[PDB]
From a paper:
The global conformation of our CSFV [name] structures is consistent with the recently reported CSFV structure with an RMSD value of 0.9 Å (95% coverage) between the reported structure and our representative C-682 structure. The NTD interacts with the palm of the RdRP core intra-molecularly with a mixture of hydrophobic and hydrogen bonding interactions. Collectively, these biochemical data indicated that the RNA synthesis fidelity of CSFV [name] is fine-tuned by its NTD through the intra-molecular interactions with the RdRP palm.
To better understand the nature of the NTD–RdRP intra-molecular interface interactions and whether they regulate the RdRP fidelity, we designed point mutations at the Y471 and E472 sites in the context of the WT [name] and the N- and C-terminal deletion mutants. Crystallization screenings were performed for all the NTD containing mutant constructs and four of them were successfully crystallized with one construct crystallized under two different conditions. Among these five structures, three of them ([name] and two forms of C-672_[name]) maintain the WT conformation with the NTD–RdRP intra-molecular interface maintained. These structural data together suggest that the selection of Y471-E472 mutation sites is valid in perturbing the NTD–RdRP interface, but the interface may not necessarily be fully disrupted by some of the mutations. Although NTD–RdRP disengagement, a situation mimicked by the crystallographic open conformation state in a crystal lattice or the N-91 construct in solution, results in fidelity reduction, engaged NTD–RdRP with perturbation from point mutations can achieve similar level of fidelity reduction.
Residue numbers in the entry: 13 to 125, 131 to 531, 538 to 670
Amino acid sequence: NLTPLFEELLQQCPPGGQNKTAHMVSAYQLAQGNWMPTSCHVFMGTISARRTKTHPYEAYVKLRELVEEHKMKTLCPGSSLGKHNDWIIGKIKYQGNLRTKHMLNPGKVAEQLRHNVYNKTIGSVMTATGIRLEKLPVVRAQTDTTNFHQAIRDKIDKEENLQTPGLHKKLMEVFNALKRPELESSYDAVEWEELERGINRKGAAGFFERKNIGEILDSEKNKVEEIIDNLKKGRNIKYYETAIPKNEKRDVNDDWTAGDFVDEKKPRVIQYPEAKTRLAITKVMYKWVKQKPVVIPGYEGKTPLFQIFDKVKKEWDQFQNPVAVSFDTKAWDTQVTTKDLELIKDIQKYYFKKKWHKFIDTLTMHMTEVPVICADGEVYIRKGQRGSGQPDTSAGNSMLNVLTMVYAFCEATGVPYKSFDRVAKIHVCGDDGFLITERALGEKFASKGVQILAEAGKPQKITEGDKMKVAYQFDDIEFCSHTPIQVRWSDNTSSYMPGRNTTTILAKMATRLDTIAYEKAVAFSFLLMYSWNPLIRRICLLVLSTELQVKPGKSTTYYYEGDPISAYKEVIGHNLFDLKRTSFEKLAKLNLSMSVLGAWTRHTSKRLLQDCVNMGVKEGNWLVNADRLVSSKTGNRYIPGEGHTLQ
């Protein structure tokens, strides 16, 4: 009866190792009585206990006392600064004002010297149909400096999470089972041309950096190569990261993205090393941080969003009663421990050539304890954790996440590490992800996994009944802020597309953070993902019919060469005209938020179709005739030119 209070309390106990020297009892076992707790040091949901005719309520109180005693005996151990970073001291000009409780705020340096706006064409397309933009949810809002200081105190300002003893030994036991020995010690850095190929010249400037990436590349490339050598030999350098709030002017991505969802998952606190330091890290570790080739099992950072759910359902279909168990770690970046970072270090040393291990052993040391500069000049010393702007973020988090989840899953079920790829499939993109396995294993892992994942220091989001999110049918999987939605093509074949709430799609489509060429690029980018949504599909076509003489802009996720309907068929595998049905039920779910907020009218759907037909019945070759129902209504079809989709 009193069993849950033990389970909730067990999520607060310090991680311990196997203690065979005493009796280790379960949370349900404690609720049965005749058991008095002997230590709040917990291991796999068990604690050392003695049998002594106890009342349950007493056992909890002794545990509450055991835990409270330790909490007031293991708080403020103390923050220390590493010598290799002493150089930052000489830069303080004023006293510190962060009022941090767990990390040093040694002072402030001297300072140096964006709005949410609507896309004029798209927005005029929506409004003309009765969509009320004001009713759409806010997206990509910025935050004030006072919330920023409190945000850092709220989420960053935390000591490293305690982890189970010897864990990283076990995590290496898992990695050895999925190493790719045909590549051991085979990675080398790439040359300047390969690095500059896929790069944004507008890469974010450091706090002490004046020039962007494109400027740093065009003129100070020699400076970057100097950084590498000092690291190549194990020499300290001026490592610092700049802290700005998400959607500040310098929240700019160095590398390509798969969609707007990546920006949505960025923490409230963006932390990145200098443009020059990022370039040095990227030129050296290119094959890792960009996962070329992919050696992280189930890493979907390169999988385009329109492929992922087709790719997964092919795995889904091979199980007897599959479930998908979601990973939902609370603010992952703040939970990377120092010991976790050397686990990636020891892994990066595995795949890199012998001539770079000193580089890695050194750069890890800096990342063990990083000096960070706020936008306003306040300086704090972060104990470990992952900076969202580091080049190793997605690569390092992803490989970190798989090992951690496999450990939690395998130890929860009894499945041996070497047998995993046989009884389960996993897919991750940074901290977000899930695993597929049989309902038996999935329900077992989902119930015990929350506590185990607390013992490894990756606490999950508080959920109902302390159980991980379990998907029992395919299109309930949630991944990368999207979810599978079925479509049936004209040839009676089925595929899945990335589904998402209609409200969210409209908002992210109608806005930007501070031209008509751009809006056609957005229209195409959204069309590749959301052609299942008849509202979006037709809005997108209308924008594409707008001033056909203009070429599409190239600043966003995708753009097209030539006729766009061809580009759709090139990557999707079917012509847009072949979309005959969108999954009936799932569309109802995703459109509900539209009616919840009242963002549309009872005739909005019809007014949009009727708006598209008006442009479509006129004689000639019109984009809107790609829509099967529009073409069914106009009697004419769209005949595509040549087309190609490019990033």
